[PDB]
Amino acid sequence: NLADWETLPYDSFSPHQDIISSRLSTLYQLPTMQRGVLIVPVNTLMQRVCPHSFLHGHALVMKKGQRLSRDALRTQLDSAGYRHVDQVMEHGEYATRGALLDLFPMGSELPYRLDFFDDEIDSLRVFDVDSQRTLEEVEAINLLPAHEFPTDKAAIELFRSQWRDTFEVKRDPEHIYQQVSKGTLPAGIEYWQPLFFSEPLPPLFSYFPANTLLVNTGDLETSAERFQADTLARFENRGVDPMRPLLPPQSLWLRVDELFSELKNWPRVQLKTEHLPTKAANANLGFQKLPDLAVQAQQKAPLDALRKFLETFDGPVVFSVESEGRREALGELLARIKIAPQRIMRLDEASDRGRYLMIGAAEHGFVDTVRNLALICESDLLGERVARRRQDSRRTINPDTLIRN
Amino acid sequence: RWLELGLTDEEKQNQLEQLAEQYDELKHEFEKKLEAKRRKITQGDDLAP
Secondary structure (H helix, E strand, O other), X not given: OOOOOOOOOOOOOOOOHHHHHHHHHHHHOOOOOOOOOOOOOHHHHOOOOOOHHHHHHHOEEEEOOOOOOHHHHHHHHHHOOOEEOOOOOOOOEEEEEOOEEEXXXXXXXXXXXXXXXXXXXXXXXXXXXXXXXXXXXXOEEEEOOOOOXXXXXXXXXXXXXXXXXXXXXXXXXXXHHHXXXXXXXXXXXXXXXXXXXXXXXXXXXXXOOOOOOEEEEOOHHXXXXXXXXXXXXHHHHOOOOOOOOOOOHHHHOOOHHHHHHHHOOOXXXXXXXXXXXXXXXXXXOOEEEOOOOOOOOOOOOOOHHHHHHHHHOOOOEEEEEOOHHHHHHHHHHHHHHOOOOEEOOOHHHOOOOOEEEEEOOOOOOEEEOOOOOEEEOOOOOOOXXXXXXXXXXXXXXXXXXXXXX | OOOOOOOOOOHHHHHHHHHHHHHHHXXXXXXXXXXXXXXXXXXXXXXXX
Protein backbone atom coordinates (compact mmCIF):
# COMPACT_ATOMS: atom_id res chain seq x y z
CA ASN A 1 0.00 0.00 0.00
CA LEU A 2 1.19 3.46 -0.76
CA ALA A 3 -0.69 5.23 1.95
CA ASP A 4 -1.03 8.99 1.86
CA TRP A 5 -0.74 11.83 4.33
CA GLU A 6 -4.46 11.68 5.27
CA THR A 7 -4.68 15.42 5.81
CA LEU A 8 -6.56 18.31 4.32
CA PRO A 9 -5.72 19.69 0.90
CA TYR A 10 -3.79 22.68 2.24
CA ASP A 11 -3.83 21.31 5.75
CA SER A 12 -2.23 23.18 8.64
CA PHE A 13 -0.82 20.23 10.56
CA SER A 14 1.77 17.51 10.29
CA PRO A 15 0.89 13.99 9.12
CA HIS A 16 2.17 11.06 11.12
CA GLN A 17 5.77 10.55 10.09
CA ASP A 18 5.87 6.81 10.48
CA ILE A 19 3.75 5.84 7.51
CA ILE A 20 5.62 8.66 5.81
CA SER A 21 8.77 6.77 6.68
CA SER A 22 6.96 3.71 5.37
CA ARG A 23 6.15 5.59 2.19
CA LEU A 24 9.80 6.58 2.24
CA SER A 25 10.60 2.88 2.12
CA THR A 26 8.24 2.73 -0.82
CA LEU A 27 10.16 5.71 -2.13
CA TYR A 28 13.27 3.76 -1.21
CA GLN A 29 11.90 0.61 -2.89
CA LEU A 30 10.08 1.54 -6.11
CA PRO A 31 12.69 1.64 -8.99
CA THR A 32 14.19 -1.63 -7.74
CA MET A 33 11.25 -3.90 -7.92
CA GLN A 34 10.82 -7.15 -9.83
CA ARG A 35 7.36 -8.52 -8.91
CA GLY A 36 4.65 -7.83 -6.36
CA VAL A 37 2.39 -4.81 -6.44
CA LEU A 38 1.95 -1.30 -5.15
CA ILE A 39 -1.43 0.38 -5.04
CA VAL A 40 -1.93 4.13 -5.28
CA PRO A 41 -4.94 6.44 -5.39
CA VAL A 42 -4.87 9.32 -7.84
CA ASN A 43 -4.76 11.90 -5.07
CA THR A 44 -1.84 9.93 -3.74
CA LEU A 45 -0.65 9.67 -7.32
CA MET A 46 -0.37 13.45 -7.58
CA GLN A 47 2.30 13.93 -4.89
CA ARG A 48 5.45 14.46 -6.93
CA VAL A 49 8.27 13.42 -4.68
CA CYS A 50 12.01 14.17 -4.26
CA PRO A 51 14.32 12.09 -6.49
CA HIS A 52 15.50 8.60 -5.73
CA SER A 53 19.01 9.84 -6.46
CA PHE A 54 18.55 12.28 -3.57
CA LEU A 55 17.28 9.46 -1.42
CA HIS A 56 20.07 7.10 -2.46
CA GLY A 57 22.78 9.62 -1.73
CA HIS A 58 21.17 10.40 1.58
CA ALA A 59 20.15 6.91 2.68
CA LEU A 60 23.24 4.98 3.69
CA VAL A 61 24.47 1.70 5.22
CA MET A 62 26.49 0.80 8.29
CA LYS A 63 27.99 -2.66 8.76
CA LYS A 64 28.86 -4.93 11.67
CA GLY A 65 32.66 -4.69 11.81
CA GLN A 66 33.02 -1.25 10.29
CA ARG A 67 35.61 1.29 11.46
CA LEU A 68 33.59 4.30 12.56
CA SER A 69 33.78 7.02 15.18
CA ARG A 70 30.70 7.65 17.27
CA ASP A 71 30.48 11.40 16.90
CA ALA A 72 31.41 11.02 13.24
CA LEU A 73 28.30 8.97 12.65
CA ARG A 74 26.42 11.32 14.98
CA THR A 75 27.47 14.20 12.77
CA GLN A 76 26.14 12.18 9.86
CA LEU A 77 22.95 11.91 11.90
CA ASP A 78 22.87 15.68 12.16
CA SER A 79 23.24 15.59 8.39
CA ALA A 80 20.30 13.20 8.52
CA GLY A 81 18.50 15.83 10.58
CA TYR A 82 17.88 13.26 13.25
CA ARG A 83 16.08 14.67 16.27
CA HIS A 84 17.83 14.51 19.63
CA VAL A 85 15.37 12.98 22.06
CA ASP A 86 16.29 11.91 25.57
CA GLN A 87 13.63 9.18 25.42
CA VAL A 88 13.14 8.26 21.80
CA MET A 89 9.78 7.03 20.54
CA GLU A 90 9.58 7.48 16.74
CA HIS A 91 11.63 7.86 13.58
CA GLY A 92 14.68 10.09 13.20
CA GLU A 93 15.16 10.36 16.95
CA TYR A 94 18.32 9.56 18.81
CA ALA A 95 19.69 9.26 22.32
CA THR A 96 23.24 9.49 23.64
CA ARG A 97 24.23 6.85 26.22
CA GLY A 98 27.92 6.09 26.70
CA ALA A 99 29.47 4.36 23.72
CA LEU A 100 25.86 3.43 22.81
CA LEU A 101 23.96 5.72 20.35
CA ASP A 102 20.30 4.64 20.28
CA LEU A 103 18.28 5.50 17.23
CA PHE A 104 15.02 4.55 15.56
CA PRO A 105 15.56 4.94 11.81
CA MET A 106 13.06 6.08 9.30
CA GLY A 107 13.39 2.97 7.26
CA SER A 108 12.80 0.19 9.69
CA GLU A 109 10.09 -1.00 12.04
CA LEU A 110 12.55 -1.13 14.90
CA PRO A 111 15.37 0.83 16.60
CA TYR A 112 19.05 0.11 16.95
CA ARG A 113 22.02 0.04 19.34
CA LEU A 114 25.52 0.69 18.14
CA ASP A 115 28.04 0.71 21.02
CA PHE A 116 31.10 1.96 19.20
CA PHE A 117 34.63 1.08 20.06
CA ASP A 118 38.01 2.49 19.00
CA ASP A 119 36.68 4.17 15.85
CA GLU A 120 34.74 1.01 15.10
CA ILE A 121 31.20 -0.29 14.84
CA ASP A 122 31.05 -3.00 17.45
CA SER A 123 27.40 -3.94 17.79
CA LEU A 124 24.14 -3.51 15.93
CA ARG A 125 21.39 -4.62 18.26
CA VAL A 126 17.63 -4.08 18.17
CA PHE A 127 14.86 -4.02 20.73
CA ASP A 128 11.32 -2.88 21.44
CA VAL A 129 11.36 0.57 23.00
CA ASP A 130 8.34 -0.14 25.16
CA SER A 131 10.20 -3.24 26.20
CA GLN A 132 13.36 -1.06 26.20
CA ARG A 133 15.24 -4.41 26.24
CA THR A 134 17.34 -6.16 23.56
CA LEU A 135 15.58 -8.33 20.99
CA GLU A 136 18.05 -9.41 18.34
CA GLU A 137 21.28 -8.71 16.51
CA VAL A 138 21.65 -7.69 12.88
CA GLU A 139 24.97 -7.22 11.12
CA ALA A 140 23.85 -4.34 8.92
CA ILE A 141 21.65 -1.27 8.69
CA ASN A 142 20.47 0.84 5.87
CA LEU A 143 19.60 4.04 7.75
CA LEU A 144 17.20 6.29 5.91
CA PRO A 145 17.69 9.90 7.02
CA ALA A 146 15.21 11.49 9.38
CA HIS A 147 13.01 13.19 6.78
CA GLU A 148 12.22 13.01 3.11
CA PHE A 149 13.33 16.51 2.95
CA PRO A 150 16.68 18.22 3.42
CA THR A 151 16.90 20.78 6.17
CA ASP A 152 20.66 21.37 6.11
CA LYS A 153 22.34 24.75 5.80
CA ALA A 154 22.41 24.59 1.99
CA ALA A 155 18.82 23.35 2.01
CA ILE A 156 17.76 26.27 4.20
CA GLU A 157 19.64 28.77 2.04
CA LEU A 158 18.20 27.54 -1.24
CA PHE A 159 14.78 27.40 0.40
CA ARG A 160 15.28 31.06 1.23
CA SER A 161 16.32 31.60 -2.39
CA GLN A 162 13.20 30.06 -3.95
CA TRP A 163 11.04 31.64 -1.23
CA ARG A 164 12.22 35.15 -1.89
CA ASP A 165 11.77 34.42 -5.57
CA THR A 166 8.17 33.47 -4.93
CA PHE A 167 6.56 34.69 -1.70
CA GLU A 168 6.63 37.84 0.36
CA VAL A 169 8.45 37.98 3.70
CA LYS A 170 7.54 39.80 6.91
CA ARG A 171 9.32 40.67 10.13
CA ASP A 172 6.75 38.49 11.90
CA PRO A 173 8.49 35.59 13.69
CA GLU A 174 5.58 33.26 12.92
CA HIS A 175 6.41 33.51 9.21
CA ILE A 176 7.19 30.18 7.55
CA TYR A 177 10.33 31.66 6.03
CA GLN A 178 11.33 32.80 9.52
CA GLN A 179 11.23 29.43 11.26
CA VAL A 180 12.92 27.69 8.37
CA SER A 181 15.56 30.41 8.51
CA LYS A 182 15.76 29.44 12.17
CA GLY A 183 15.98 25.84 10.99
CA THR A 184 12.94 24.56 12.88
CA LEU A 185 9.94 22.64 11.62
CA PRO A 186 6.52 24.12 10.83
CA ALA A 187 3.39 22.08 11.39
CA GLY A 188 1.99 22.52 7.89
CA ILE A 189 5.34 22.61 6.12
CA GLU A 190 4.61 19.49 4.09
CA TYR A 191 2.87 21.35 1.33
CA TRP A 192 5.80 23.77 1.04
CA GLN A 193 8.26 21.01 0.23
CA PRO A 194 8.72 22.06 -3.49
CA LEU A 195 10.94 24.88 -2.17
CA PHE A 196 13.96 22.57 -2.16
CA PHE A 197 14.38 21.94 -5.85
CA SER A 198 15.41 23.90 -8.91
CA GLU A 199 13.57 21.30 -10.93
CA PRO A 200 9.86 20.69 -10.62
CA LEU A 201 9.17 17.73 -8.38
CA PRO A 202 9.50 14.42 -10.24
CA PRO A 203 6.40 12.25 -10.23
CA LEU A 204 6.38 8.70 -8.99
CA PHE A 205 6.04 7.82 -12.67
CA SER A 206 9.56 9.23 -12.89
CA TYR A 207 10.49 6.42 -10.50
CA PHE A 208 8.72 3.89 -12.71
CA PRO A 209 10.82 1.16 -14.36
CA ALA A 210 9.86 -0.50 -17.61
CA ASN A 211 8.31 -3.66 -16.15
CA THR A 212 5.63 -1.82 -14.18
CA LEU A 213 1.89 -2.21 -14.74
CA LEU A 214 -0.96 0.27 -14.44
CA VAL A 215 -4.46 -0.89 -13.51
CA ASN A 216 -7.48 1.43 -13.59
CA THR A 217 -10.83 1.22 -11.86
CA GLY A 218 -13.17 4.03 -12.88
CA ASP A 219 -13.02 7.40 -14.61
CA LEU A 220 -10.39 8.35 -12.10
CA GLU A 221 -9.75 11.47 -14.13
CA THR A 222 -13.11 12.65 -12.79
CA SER A 223 -12.15 12.10 -9.16
CA ALA A 224 -8.86 13.81 -9.93
CA GLU A 225 -10.73 16.77 -11.36
CA ARG A 226 -12.92 16.84 -8.25
CA PHE A 227 -9.85 16.86 -6.05
CA GLN A 228 -8.33 19.58 -8.20
CA ALA A 229 -11.43 21.69 -7.66
CA ASP A 230 -11.51 20.95 -3.94
CA THR A 231 -7.86 21.67 -3.41
CA LEU A 232 -8.18 24.77 -5.57
CA ALA A 233 -11.05 25.87 -3.35
CA ARG A 234 -8.60 25.48 -0.49
CA PHE A 235 -6.15 27.47 -2.60
CA GLU A 236 -8.43 30.43 -2.41
CA ASN A 237 -9.78 29.80 1.11
CA ARG A 238 -6.40 29.32 2.70
CA GLY A 239 -4.78 31.56 0.08
CA VAL A 240 -5.81 34.64 1.99
CA ASP A 241 -3.54 34.01 4.97
CA PRO A 242 -0.49 36.27 5.14
CA MET A 243 0.85 33.86 7.76
CA ARG A 244 0.78 30.69 5.63
CA PRO A 245 1.41 31.41 1.94
CA LEU A 246 0.36 28.89 -0.64
CA LEU A 247 2.34 27.42 -3.50
CA PRO A 248 0.75 26.74 -6.90
CA PRO A 249 -1.30 23.54 -7.07
CA GLN A 250 0.45 23.01 -10.37
CA SER A 251 3.69 23.29 -8.44
CA LEU A 252 2.58 20.48 -6.16
CA TRP A 253 0.42 18.27 -8.30
CA LEU A 254 0.07 17.35 -11.93
CA ARG A 255 -2.98 18.12 -14.00
CA VAL A 256 -5.32 15.53 -15.39
CA ASP A 257 -4.67 15.99 -19.11
CA GLU A 258 -0.90 16.18 -18.84
CA LEU A 259 -1.21 13.34 -16.34
CA PHE A 260 -2.88 11.22 -18.98
CA SER A 261 -0.13 12.26 -21.37
CA GLU A 262 2.35 10.51 -19.13
CA LEU A 263 -0.22 7.74 -18.73
CA LYS A 264 0.43 7.14 -22.43
CA ASN A 265 3.81 5.72 -21.47
CA TRP A 266 2.72 2.50 -19.84
CA PRO A 267 0.22 -0.22 -20.68
CA ARG A 268 -2.83 -0.05 -18.49
CA VAL A 269 -5.68 -2.43 -17.88
CA GLN A 270 -9.00 -0.74 -17.18
CA LEU A 271 -11.71 -2.21 -14.97
CA LYS A 272 -15.46 -1.61 -15.28
CA THR A 273 -18.22 -3.37 -13.38
CA GLU A 274 -20.43 -2.42 -16.31
CA HIS A 275 -20.43 -4.72 -19.33
CA LEU A 276 -18.47 -3.58 -22.38
CA PRO A 277 -19.36 -3.39 -26.06
CA THR A 278 -17.83 -5.90 -28.41
CA LYS A 279 -14.97 -3.69 -29.57
CA ALA A 280 -11.44 -5.03 -29.61
CA ALA A 281 -9.42 -5.31 -26.37
CA ASN A 282 -12.65 -5.88 -24.42
CA ALA A 283 -12.70 -8.95 -22.19
CA ASN A 284 -15.92 -9.12 -20.09
CA LEU A 285 -14.82 -12.16 -18.16
CA GLY A 286 -17.36 -14.60 -16.84
CA PHE A 287 -18.32 -13.51 -13.35
CA GLN A 288 -21.63 -12.75 -11.67
CA LYS A 289 -22.50 -11.25 -8.35
CA LEU A 290 -24.05 -14.07 -6.38
CA PRO A 291 -27.66 -13.36 -5.34
CA ASP A 292 -28.28 -12.49 -1.71
CA LEU A 293 -28.38 -15.38 0.75
CA ALA A 294 -28.79 -13.57 4.07
CA VAL A 295 -29.79 -15.20 7.35
CA GLN A 296 -33.57 -15.08 7.78
CA ALA A 297 -33.71 -16.18 11.40
CA GLN A 298 -37.33 -15.24 12.13
CA GLN A 299 -38.82 -18.04 10.07
CA LYS A 300 -37.89 -21.73 10.17
CA ALA A 301 -35.41 -21.43 7.28
CA PRO A 302 -32.68 -18.80 7.23
CA LEU A 303 -30.87 -21.29 5.05
CA ASP A 304 -33.28 -22.44 2.35
CA ALA A 305 -32.13 -19.67 0.01
CA LEU A 306 -28.63 -21.01 0.59
CA ARG A 307 -29.94 -24.51 -0.08
CA LYS A 308 -31.73 -23.90 -3.38
CA PHE A 309 -28.66 -21.90 -4.30
CA LEU A 310 -26.56 -24.99 -3.54
CA GLU A 311 -28.38 -27.66 -5.49
CA THR A 312 -28.80 -25.45 -8.55
CA PHE A 313 -25.05 -24.85 -8.40
CA ASP A 314 -22.56 -27.32 -9.85
CA GLY A 315 -19.10 -26.50 -8.51
CA PRO A 316 -16.87 -25.57 -5.57
CA VAL A 317 -18.31 -23.26 -2.94
CA VAL A 318 -15.51 -21.57 -1.02
CA PHE A 319 -16.14 -19.55 2.13
CA SER A 320 -14.24 -16.44 3.12
CA VAL A 321 -13.81 -16.56 6.88
CA GLU A 322 -12.55 -13.53 8.80
CA SER A 323 -10.91 -15.61 11.54
CA GLU A 324 -10.71 -19.16 12.79
CA GLY A 325 -12.69 -17.77 15.72
CA ARG A 326 -15.23 -16.89 13.05
CA ARG A 327 -15.20 -20.38 11.59
CA GLU A 328 -16.90 -22.34 14.39
CA ALA A 329 -19.76 -19.88 14.01
CA LEU A 330 -19.71 -21.13 10.43
CA GLY A 331 -19.82 -24.64 11.86
CA GLU A 332 -22.66 -23.39 14.08
CA LEU A 333 -24.56 -22.90 10.85
CA LEU A 334 -22.83 -25.53 8.68
CA ALA A 335 -24.25 -28.34 10.79
CA ARG A 336 -27.67 -26.81 10.09
CA ILE A 337 -27.29 -27.35 6.33
CA LYS A 338 -25.87 -30.90 6.71
CA ILE A 339 -22.85 -29.82 4.61
CA ALA A 340 -19.43 -28.68 5.85
CA PRO A 341 -16.41 -27.57 3.80
CA GLN A 342 -12.75 -28.51 3.91
CA ARG A 343 -10.37 -25.68 4.82
CA ILE A 344 -7.90 -24.72 2.08
CA MET A 345 -5.37 -21.99 1.32
CA ARG A 346 -4.84 -22.59 -2.42
CA LEU A 347 -7.61 -21.36 -4.74
CA ASP A 348 -6.88 -23.56 -7.68
CA GLU A 349 -7.09 -26.79 -5.71
CA ALA A 350 -10.87 -26.40 -6.08
CA SER A 351 -12.71 -29.10 -8.06
CA ASP A 352 -16.24 -30.19 -8.93
CA ARG A 353 -18.91 -29.74 -6.25
CA GLY A 354 -16.32 -29.35 -3.53
CA ARG A 355 -17.05 -27.18 -0.53
CA TYR A 356 -13.96 -25.33 0.62
CA LEU A 357 -13.08 -22.30 2.69
CA MET A 358 -10.25 -19.86 3.36
CA ILE A 359 -9.42 -17.58 6.25
CA GLY A 360 -10.26 -14.30 4.56
CA ALA A 361 -12.27 -11.17 5.29
CA ALA A 362 -13.71 -10.86 1.78
CA GLU A 363 -16.72 -8.70 0.97
CA HIS A 364 -19.13 -10.70 -1.12
CA GLY A 365 -19.79 -14.06 -2.67
CA PHE A 366 -19.88 -14.63 -6.38
CA VAL A 367 -20.50 -17.05 -9.23
CA ASP A 368 -17.61 -17.91 -11.57
CA THR A 369 -18.74 -19.08 -14.99
CA VAL A 370 -15.38 -20.27 -16.32
CA ARG A 371 -14.50 -22.60 -13.45
CA ASN A 372 -18.11 -22.50 -12.14
CA LEU A 373 -17.03 -21.46 -8.65
CA ALA A 374 -19.26 -20.12 -5.91
CA LEU A 375 -17.97 -18.11 -3.00
CA ILE A 376 -19.64 -16.98 0.23
CA CYS A 377 -18.80 -14.14 2.64
CA GLU A 378 -20.11 -12.85 5.96
CA SER A 379 -21.57 -9.64 4.54
CA ASP A 380 -23.77 -11.73 2.27
CA LEU A 381 -25.11 -13.57 5.33
CA LEU A 382 -25.21 -11.52 8.52
CA GLY A 383 -26.19 -8.26 6.89
CA GLU A 384 -23.60 -5.52 6.68
CA ARG A 385 -20.56 -6.84 8.57
CA VAL A 386 -19.15 -3.32 8.55
CA ALA A 387 -16.06 -2.31 10.53
CA ARG A 388 -16.06 1.29 11.79
CA ARG A 389 -12.57 2.76 11.39
CA ARG A 390 -11.71 4.82 14.47
CA GLN A 391 -8.22 5.76 13.27
CA ASP A 392 -5.37 4.69 11.02
CA SER A 393 -2.64 2.14 11.69
CA ARG A 394 -0.08 4.44 13.29
CA ARG A 395 -1.76 7.05 15.47
CA THR A 396 -4.95 7.27 17.53
CA ILE A 397 -6.21 8.77 20.75
CA ASN A 398 -4.51 6.98 23.65
CA PRO A 399 -6.97 6.55 26.52
CA ASP A 400 -4.97 3.84 28.31
CA THR A 401 -1.20 4.21 27.91
CA LEU A 402 -0.78 7.99 27.66
CA ILE A 403 -2.46 9.12 30.88
CA ARG A 404 -0.68 6.24 32.60
CA ASN A 405 2.52 7.41 30.90
CA ARG B 1 9.17 48.39 2.21
CA TRP B 2 12.81 48.21 1.38
CA LEU B 3 12.92 44.79 3.01
CA GLU B 4 11.11 42.18 0.91
CA LEU B 5 12.76 43.01 -2.41
CA GLY B 6 13.94 40.16 -4.61
CA LEU B 7 17.64 39.75 -3.98
CA THR B 8 20.14 37.05 -4.92
CA ASP B 9 20.63 34.24 -2.46
CA GLU B 10 23.42 35.57 -0.28
CA GLU B 11 24.39 37.12 3.02
CA LYS B 12 23.17 40.50 1.74
CA GLN B 13 19.47 39.74 2.19
CA ASN B 14 20.44 38.11 5.49
CA GLN B 15 21.78 41.47 6.59
CA LEU B 16 18.67 43.21 5.30
CA GLU B 17 16.73 40.90 7.61
CA GLN B 18 19.18 41.85 10.36
CA LEU B 19 18.74 45.58 9.77
CA ALA B 20 14.95 45.36 9.65
CA GLU B 21 15.12 43.34 12.87
CA GLN B 22 17.24 46.06 14.45
CA TYR B 23 14.74 48.62 13.17
CA ASP B 24 11.95 46.77 14.96
CA GLU B 25 14.22 46.52 18.01
CA LEU B 26 14.66 50.30 18.05
CA LYS B 27 10.90 50.64 17.72
CA HIS B 28 10.54 48.51 20.84
CA GLU B 29 13.31 50.48 22.53
CA PHE B 30 11.38 53.68 21.81
CA GLU B 31 8.06 52.32 23.02
CA LYS B 32 9.58 51.18 26.30
CA LYS B 33 11.88 54.17 26.85
CA LEU B 34 9.14 56.73 26.24
CA GLU B 35 6.86 55.21 28.86
CA ALA B 36 9.86 54.74 31.15
CA LYS B 37 10.78 58.42 31.09
CA ARG B 38 7.08 59.27 31.33
CA ARG B 39 6.73 57.37 34.61
CA LYS B 40 10.10 58.70 35.77
CA ILE B 41 8.98 62.31 35.37
CA THR B 42 5.43 61.85 36.61
CA GLN B 43 6.20 59.82 39.72
CA GLY B 44 6.45 61.20 43.21
CA ASP B 45 9.71 62.45 44.65
CA ASP B 46 11.15 61.13 47.90
CA LEU B 47 11.58 63.59 50.74
CA ALA B 48 12.44 63.98 54.39
CA PRO B 49 9.73 63.58 57.03
